[PDB]
Recover the amino acids of this structure.
């Protein structure tokens, strides 16, 4: 059934991915401030 | 055991089955289940060919499609009368929305320099009120940041919580004897009407998600 | 009770439903309806007497529900199925006509009529 | 509400983003071109 | 634009399906000339 | 509490089996036919050309 | 041409037929699909002008 | 606590006010249906599912108020 | 004691405000009916069921409101 | 006494509910006039509609009014 | 202290009033759609995206309001 | 404390202001749909202006909301 | 003291109510712009600057209200 067709969406979707890494770090710090429960 | 993690896996397993076990022999006439996934594909093909309609409409069609299917399936999973929060874990949906907003702002900046901010002067208008219309254009630009996530999150969470609260009341309603359950069908019918509605408001929210983040992407991709 | 007429013909006529595209949007008339005068625009029209339906493509005219339930329809020339590939050839001409240009209004109207026929 | 204040935010968010990325790649490379394959094949047969 | 000119053109445009008969074409084609007058002094007959 | 919620879901699936499973059968059927008719028509079409 | 009639006689696709057999006999199928996947397009015009377009909208 | 419990019951009543907007909303969708159908006749087959949808969506905003009301009232 | 009883009597009153909306709503559906039927008298036989549906639903928003009023009024 | 106070204040609040019905009645009568003035002869059908519309509009207010009385009197 | 908890639940009730406007708003967009469709039934496919946009955008202000309510209630 | 209670009350009252913006947005879109159904074709000119009008109607509501957060946190 | 500090915050909250009228207001001007332009196709050259004036003026009542809200909150 399935067939892999490469999608070079890496350079296309580069600003989306950049926001994700920043938020990964930022939600950690927000979590750290709340985990001092 | 992390319930949220387990139901995210369950969503993944549902989606794999929809293009495999749904499909039955790579039919050229179309498998009965797989006919659904033709129609969804086409009404979103013609929607994002409509909405952004570039030469890269389809280049952002997978992104708009996995936001469709994620919300479409996770608003079946959240509808099970014995299942745990996903979208009602608001933090995943709102975080994802803010991420998409930041990835739009960055895309607009990347593609159109610092004259990306020329987007926020809306129209030719008298020069003494040109700066005002930048302040309350930029304000509206990151209102899209939280609006997109919070719309879906609130609807799914509130619906399930409403049903559960009415179910709990009907527990104490049925703790008044069966003669009250002569003419006592109406609160059950109210939860039923809501149960029909909660799938609906999730697919409508999924469509609203995917049409609005095509419109925002129209703004971000096409400067004016 | 319909009165549908044209100069050369007094086509069809009682007439149960008439469905019209007018400067009032689209209107359906069944029995007594309010006595109005409406400018008929170029139209795709269905006329039903019972469930039997006669289908007309219409050049615009005037429509008037009369206070006596006489639906006076006056038109110039028309059926939609008799009228209907040469319309695609005429479409190329009208686009060309818009290219050159009262001539502007003519060419614009031709494009409008072409669209309207193309709809059915 | 306790359900909207865990501290397991990053635990959740990691597994959550793993499901998203999986579906994105999965759609984009696998399942989307297989639907378009049906379309193009149907048209190629339609032509033939 | 003028209403009766609008309807006229619409009828004329309608005189162009492929099955069309001469009488239709004649009902929406005329080569007449309106002999413009004044007062006596008559501006020349211009094609209607 | 949650058994009431299951009664509502059970009612929901009852409505679905009345209306939707035959409707979706009809929908699926409709598409299956349309695709098939185009395909079999096209097969006929080239055969005419062969004979010509 | 007799053989051509015979070849249509011995196969009349009309229910199913794997798209893999169609790819194997016409790798152009997979080529056009791939070029579309690469372009960021998903319109097949004849699947719209001689097949439906399944949209409620 | 007598104050806090009283505050719940008062706050519940306040949320109940919101229902007025939804009530008017339902009528507005149906008013459009009646006007449109009276004009055209025949449009109704397409339009009737849309009219139900319009009622439901207006109602849904109402239900969000209703869950806050019930959260205080019952809960 | 006094606090709970007070909260009930105040909260009931507050709830009653929501009910006004449904009253206006009902009138809007009926208005559309009259105007519509004026425009085409023979649309009436189809439209009268539809109208009653719109009325009932507008009223229904009122029923839920009034229930909450009585729950606060009479426990 | 706080409980008695709550009754009299509470009664006032409930009185607000009636306003919607008063408006409602006006809207029905306005529609009657619009329909009648446009058609003339729709009237014989429309007259039972108008009375009905009055009654239903009034009724929602009436529910408010009885709640006002119940709190007022006790 | 009791005052704080009281204020949380009272404040929750108060905020909920803001939602009513959006509930009317949704209905208004659908009313326009219904009238537009009856006056031209072929407008629908271009209009359907704009209609959905209007539903969401109208709703959004109400959900911001509701979120403040949830900040008080849950928070 | 009374001050802590007071910020919770003040935040609640400010939130109601959003109501007007929600109505506002619907009024722009209603006119958009009506205009386009009249013309079949006004939309191209109208749509940029309409998005401006929506934004502005919404913006007023956001002023209410921003006061709510300034109260609640501050 | 505590009551006065409270009254500053509370007074600000109450003040914020006036803004709602401007929210509706800007929209009525833009709606009329759309309606006018849909009637003429061509009123717009006069009407667009005229409409921007109408927006600015309608917005202003909300802004006066907002100013008072800030004076109460911060002051």
């Amino acid at each position: 059934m399935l067939k892999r067709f490469p999608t070079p969406i890496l350079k296309v979707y580069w600003p989306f991915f950049v926001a994700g890494a920043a938020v990964y770090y930022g939600m950690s710090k927000a979590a750290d401030l709340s985990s001092n429960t | 055991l992390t319930t949220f993690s387990l139901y995210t896996i369950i969503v993944l397993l549902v989606i794999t089955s929809l293009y495999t076990l749904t499909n039955n022999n790579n039919k050229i006439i179309g498998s009965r289940w797989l006919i659904s996934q033709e129609a969804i594909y086409d009404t979103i093909m013609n929607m994002t060919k409509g909405q952004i309609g570039g030469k890269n409409w389809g280049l952002y069609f997978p992104m708009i499609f996995t936001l469709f299917m994620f919300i479409f399936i996770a608003n079946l999973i959240s509808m099970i009368p014995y299942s745990f929060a996903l979208s009602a874990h608001l933090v995943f949906i709102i975080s994802l929305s803010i991420v998409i907003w930041l990835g739009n702002t960055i895309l607009g900046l990347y593609k159109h320099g610092w004259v990306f901010f020329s987007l926020f002067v809306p129209a030719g208008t008298p020069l003494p009120l040109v700066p005002l219309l930048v302040i309350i254009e930029t304000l509206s630009y990151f209102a899209r940041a939280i609006s997109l996530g919070l719309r879906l999150g609130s609807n799914i969470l509130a619906g399930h919580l409403l049903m559960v609260i009415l179910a709990g009341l009907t527990f104490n309603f049925m703790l008044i004897n069966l003669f009250t359950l002569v003419f006592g069908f109406v609160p059950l019918a109210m939860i039923l009407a809501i149960m029909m509605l909660e799938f609906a408001i999730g697919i409508i929210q999924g469509y609203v998600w995917a049409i609005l983040t095509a419109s925002y992407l129209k703004d971000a991709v096409y400067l004016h | 009770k319909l009165q549908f007429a044209l100069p050369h013909e007094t086509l069809y006529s009682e007439v149960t439903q008439v469905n019209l595209p007018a400067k009032s949007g689209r209107i359906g008339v069944l029995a007594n309806h309010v006595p109005t005068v409406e400018q008929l625009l170029p139209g795709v029209v269905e006329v039903m007497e019972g469930s039997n339906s006669k289908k007309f493509f219409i050049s615009g005219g005037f429509a008037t529900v009369q206070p006596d339930s006489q639906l006076c329809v006056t038109a110039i020339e028309a059926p939609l199925e008799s009228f209907s590939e040469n319309i695609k050839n005429l479409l190329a001409e009208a686009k060309k006509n818009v290219s050159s240009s009262r001539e502007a209004a003519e060419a614009a109207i031709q494009v409008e009529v072409l669209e309207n026929l193309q709809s059915v | 509400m306790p359900q909207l204040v865990p501290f397991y935010f990053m635990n959740q968010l990691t597994y959550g983003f793993l499901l998203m990325i999986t579906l994105l790649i999965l759609f984009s490379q696998f399942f989307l071109p297989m639907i378009l394959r049906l379309y193009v094949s149907r048209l190629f047969i339609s032509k033939l | 634009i003028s209403y009766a000119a609008y309807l006229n053109v619409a009828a004329q445009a309608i005189r162009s399906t492929e099955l069309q008969t001469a009488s239709v074409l004649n009902r929406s084609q005329t080569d007449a000339f309106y002999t413009q007058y004044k007062n006596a002094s008559e501006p020349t007959p211009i094609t209607k | 509490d949650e058994s009431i919620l299951l009664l509502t879901f059970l009612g929901f699936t009852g409505l679905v089996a009345k209306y939707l499973a035959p409707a979706y059968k009809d929908f699926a059927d409709a598409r299956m036919k349309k695709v098939s008719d185009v395909l079999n028509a096209s097969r006929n079409k080239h055969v005419e050309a062969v004979k010509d | 041409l007799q053989s051509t009639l015979d070849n249509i006689q011995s196969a009349r696709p009309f229910d199913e037929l794997t798209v893999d057999d169609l790819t194997k006999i016409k790798p152009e199928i997979d080529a056009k699909v791939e070029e579309m996947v690469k372009k960021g397009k998903w319109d097949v015009p004849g699947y719209k002008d001689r097949f439906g377009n399944l949209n409620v909208m | 606590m007598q104050l806090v419990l009283a505050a719940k019951y008062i706050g519940a009543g306040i949320s109940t006010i919101g229902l007025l907007g939804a009530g008017i909303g339902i009528a507005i969708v149906f008013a459009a249906l009646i006007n449109g159908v009276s004009r055209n006749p025949s449009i109704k087959d397409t339009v009737f599912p849309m009219a139900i949808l319009g009622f439901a969506l207006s109602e849904a905003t109402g239900l969000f108020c209703l869950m806050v009301s019930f959260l205080l009232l019952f809960g």
